[PDB]
């Protein structure tokens, strides 16, 4: 039982999963359905189909709380990074602007060693 | 190179009007090959931009 007409959509799309969270413009979360929350598991969580399913779930759960328009912030080297936006669009929401907020260090912390697979 | 072409045009960390160019839309220093500066004036521009960022006349990252 809330009512936030305008909100923000954060889409974190990694190589292993995707998480969509809907917040008010102040950073308080409304709904957050993710790829594992939708029925999926394992390596299927990285497929674009799972991403768009999670986007639909989150969009409708937020509409139930009263959101009509969301600004989009995407980050991560994922594959559902655009399919989630398309599902947010064609699940009853208008997005408008889209931002890229992938964190970029200024040559800071040492990364883990390269996989010898 | 503009600074070689016309001399006595000082590069300084306080001249934000001149430093607005040579920085990309996201605030990154433009490459040397796309501005045509010589090596020495490219170094001067990079130094001025770094000092301006540090002293907060320019953003570190205009995300």
């Amino acid at each position: 039982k809330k009512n936030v007409p305008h909100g923000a959509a954060h889409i974190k799309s990694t190589f292993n999963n995707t998480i969509v969270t809907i917040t008010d413009p102040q950073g308080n979360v409304i709904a957050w359905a993710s790829s594992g929350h939708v029925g999926f598991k394992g390596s299927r969580k990285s497929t674009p189909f799972a991403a768009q399913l999670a986007a639909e779930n989150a969009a409708r759960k937020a509409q139930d709380h009263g959101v009509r328009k969301v600004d989009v912030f995407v980050k991560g080297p994922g594959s559902g990074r655009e399919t989630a936006i398309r599902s947010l669009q064609a699940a009853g929401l208008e997005v408008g602007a889209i931002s890229d907020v992938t964190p970029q260090p200024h040559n800071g912390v040492r990364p883990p060693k390269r996989r010898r697979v | 190179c503009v600074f070689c072409a016309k001399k006595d045009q000082a590069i300084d960390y306080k001249d934000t009007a001149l430093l607005r160019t040579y920085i990309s839309e996201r605030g990154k220093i433009r490459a040397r090959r796309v501005t045509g500066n010589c090596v020495q004036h490219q170094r001067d521009i990079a130094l001025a931009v770094k000092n301006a960022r540090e002293v907060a006349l320019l953003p570190f990252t205009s995300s």
Partner: protein, 95 residues
């Protein structure tokens, strides 16, 4: 004595009136040691490119002194120790 150029950012809560007399003491600490103070230009409030000490504004001042290195080190130590100063940046106008 070398030419130095000190630029200062001050707390925006300060009014742009008492700023000129406030730094006169930090100028007298140079004048006693035997330096010169040429231009004390003030820029006034400007919006900083980013949050410095939870202040989106600040007063920019350029000191433009010419004195001995130990004197300038004493000056900027005193400024950084002062509470109304946000940032200090000392440079040499020559090489």
């Amino acid at each position: 004595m070398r030419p130095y150029e000190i630029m200062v950012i001050l707390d925006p809560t300060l009014d742009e009136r008492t700023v000129a007399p406030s730094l006169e003491t930090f100028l007298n600490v140079v004048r006693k040691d035997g330096g010169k103070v040429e231009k004390v230009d003030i820029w006034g409030k400007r919006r900083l490119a980013y949050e410095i000490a939870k202040h989106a504004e600040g007063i920019y001042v350029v000191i433009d002194v010419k004195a001995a290195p130990a004197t300038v080190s004493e000056l900027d130590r005193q400024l950084s120790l002062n509470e109304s100063v946000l940032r200090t940046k000392v440079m040499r106008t020559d090489k």
